[PDB]
């Protein structure tokens, strides 16, 4: 594993009364640790993982300040993108942002990230070089010039290489027991008569971390992609993850079927069968 | 830690 830290910003204009809402959440790998909501009566930045709480009050006053300021700016931005596209304040619109740093081998920036989207479709993004942008449309192009002349790119790189990398390492040491650790899937297989002459086999993977997993069914050497039913990886709600993989097989005949799971807490790719 | 505020203005879109 090569650890990373992400921040997700959601700005959203209101159709009714009220100012646009700014929600920020941050993650180290697949673990959330901080949240901020501008609806909260007196809005503050709050902890979301045990290991963060050791940080002094200076740290949280520092976060609040950042997000509060970001709320005011994202309200400006919305008006602007309302204009860029020529849209009434009738319609409700969403800006998203997703930025962070991936931690390479020498414990340094492998690559930095920053992507903006408007209404779920790609807007602007910092490139790999961390000094040029990618405008997806004519409106995004207006921002680019503005951002080139303001030299946002220079402030972005300064953070991504500098503090982002520095703080991720502080977090990675201070919660290491959970963050540096991989919890393997607890796997069992399941059987349910479809017919009459058929049955579903559900291969389970519970309580695992990180979310990265690979559940595939095999009748022989060739995959059962057609037709295996795979669900999206889901939260248990205690910080672990869940997933399952299913196929319909003839009630023969289940013998001929092996499940195969791949994780990061598994030394050898674990392989399973149904047991009557 | 999120990207902290710049010395200058926090540039919008």
């Amino acid at each position, epitope marked *: 594993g090569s650890h990373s830290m992400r921040y997700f910003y959601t700005a959203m204009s209101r159709p009714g009364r009220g100012e646009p809402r700014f929600i920020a959440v941050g993650y180290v790998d697949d673990t959330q640790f901080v949240r901020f909501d501008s609806d909260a009566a007196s809005p503050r930045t709050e902890p979301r993982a045990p290991w963060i709480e050791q940080e002094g009050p200076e740290y949280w006053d*520092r976060n609040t*300040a950042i997000f509060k*300021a970001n709320t005011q700016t994202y309200r400006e931005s919305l008006r602007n993108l309302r204009g860029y596209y020529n849209q009434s304040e009738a319609g409700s619109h969403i800006i998203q942002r997703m930025y962070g740093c991936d931690l390479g081998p020498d414990g340094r920036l492998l690559r930095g990230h920053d992507q903006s989207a408007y209404d779920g479709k790609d807007y602007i993004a910092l490139n790999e070089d961390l000094s040029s942008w990618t405008a997806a449309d004519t409106a995004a192009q207006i921002t680019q010039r503005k951002w080139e*002349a*303001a*030299r946002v790119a*220079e*402030a972005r*790189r*300064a*953070y991504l*290489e*500098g*503090l982002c*990398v*520095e703080w991720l390492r502080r977090y990675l040491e201070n919660g290491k027991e959970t963050l540096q650790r991989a919890d393997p899937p607890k796997t069992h297989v399941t059987h349910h008569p479809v017919s009459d002459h058929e049955a579903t086999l559900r291969c389970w993977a519970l309580g695992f971390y990180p979310a990265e997993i690979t559940l595939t069914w095999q009748r022989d050497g060739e995959d059962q992609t057609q037709d295996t039913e795979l669900v999206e990886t889901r939260p248990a709600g205690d910080r672990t993850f869940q997933k399952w993989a299913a196929v319909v097989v003839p009630s023969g005949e289940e013998q001929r079927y092996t499940c195969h799971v791949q994780h990061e807490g598994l030394p050898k790719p674990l392989t399973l069968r149904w047991e009557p | 830690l999120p990207e*902290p*505020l*710049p*010395q*200058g*203005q*926090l540039t919008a879109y």
Partner: T-cell receptor
Amino acid sequence: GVTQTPKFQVLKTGQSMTLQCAQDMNHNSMYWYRQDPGMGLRLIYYSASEGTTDKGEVPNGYNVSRLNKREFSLRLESAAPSQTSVYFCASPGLAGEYEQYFGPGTRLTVTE
Amino acid sequence: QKVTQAQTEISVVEDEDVTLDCVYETRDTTYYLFWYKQPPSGELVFLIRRNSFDEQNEISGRYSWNFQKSTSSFNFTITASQVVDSAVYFCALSGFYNTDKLIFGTGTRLQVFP
């Protein structure tokens, strides 16, 4: 750019005066420096943001008031000859080639 | 933390070359460096800003800079010096964030004579 009043001032020991600084660039940060021969620019106080202040290197005898996001204020409640100096106000950004980040500076003499 | 300009007053005649030395001290990984000119006039005119993560080569006509991050120096160099260059020169170090203290050097007076 950043403006700064007054340009010159004369004062008698014990008296007050507020140097006013103003920035129109929407910058968060505002800084106060004195200049004294062969001493460079030493910080006095600064402001991270609206309604926030922090000591510098020479905060003695100096007080500040970050009024709003536009205006910083350097206040001398009791003048002293050792405060004879040129005072510059600073508000740095990233586009220095075409935006002025320093006030003209205010010449100040404190006499007996 | 620290910005040093060991040079106090320095003299050159027209057309001659000058290199104004400047050395910094930080524990930080990211930072940028200022150069400012103070003419006999009083005001401060911007010469250059340079980020720590930038390149090394900076030739901009007569005024030129050399930023060696390993030996923590940033040296301004005027070729074909003119009487007009006569000023006090300031090196400065700062962080990128609103909370960061912009720290100045002691300065250097350059007197270009004809």
